[PDB]
Amino acid sequence: ESTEAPWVTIVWDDPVNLMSYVTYVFQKLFGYSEPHATKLMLQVHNEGKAVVSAGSRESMEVDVSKLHAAGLWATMQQDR
Template sequence: MAGPLAPTWTPETTSDERSELDRPWVTIVWNDPVNLMTYVTFVLQELFGYDEATATALMLQVHHDGKAVVSSGPRERMEHDTSRLHAYGLWASYQRDT
């Protein structure tokens, strides 16, 4: 014979917590004093499949604004994208989208 059932408790999440969990992660490329603009454009095309115009626009954003978001999605994929950018010698990081 089974014993009495224990009450179940499910923690409630607030709308602020849900919106924090729903926010995607982004990969950011940072401006650096080492890599040529043409090289950054090449890497963005190579790694993310951007056409030349899109890759150039992102590179110019990095050059003028100091950074650009180059991909977004789940944390694991952003970690992977950041690692791949590092392998090409670019300065990159990932964070929750703001």
């Protein structure tokens, strides 16, 4: 099945990181506005996870690495 397909980066809720820290990380790493970053942060906190970015597999590998360096629990998967 064709592997040339889009992927997403997902951030998972963690019990240590501050909600204010998560909002800041999404702004700093992705350039998102505050309303956007806060909405994503709250989605992680209230649903347990959220898609935070989307693109090619190789581009999502970078976003995962960036988020891990910031201390956030990030994974990637194919978007169906």
